[PDB]
């Protein structure tokens, strides 16, 4: 599908509310495999299971390894802009 920009709002006491799978070492993008109910990704409305995360706050996630992506995503705070694509 089309490349989408999606805004997520979160406070520092909570996580993003997503589970991710994949990574370059698996030949798979960083994929959202779970949206957890009532947590920031669910609340923002624009992120879906099966979305590939290409970037977050302008930080590239293309061709990142799984744990590289975990560190990058978990560092983001406040108003977070996701660049995602559903394939």
């Amino acid at each position: 599908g089309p490349i989408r920009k999606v805004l997520l709002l979160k406070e520092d006491h909570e996580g993003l509310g997503i589970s991710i799978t994949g990574g370059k070492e698996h030949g798979v993008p960083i994929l959202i495999s779970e949206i957890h109910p009532g947590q920031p990704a669910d609340r923002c409305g624009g992120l879906h299971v099966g979305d590939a995360i290409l970037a977050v706050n302008g930080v590239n996630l293309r061709d990142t390894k799984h744990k590289e992506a975990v560190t990058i995503l978990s560092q983001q705070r406040g108003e977070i802009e996701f660049e995602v694509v559903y394939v």
């Binding site: 996580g15 993003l16 991710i20 698996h26 779970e34 957890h36």
Partner: peptide
């Protein structure tokens, strides 16, 4: 289960 999954 071949792929890793992380909750974030």
């Amino acid at each position: 289960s071949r792929l890793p999954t992380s909750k974030i």
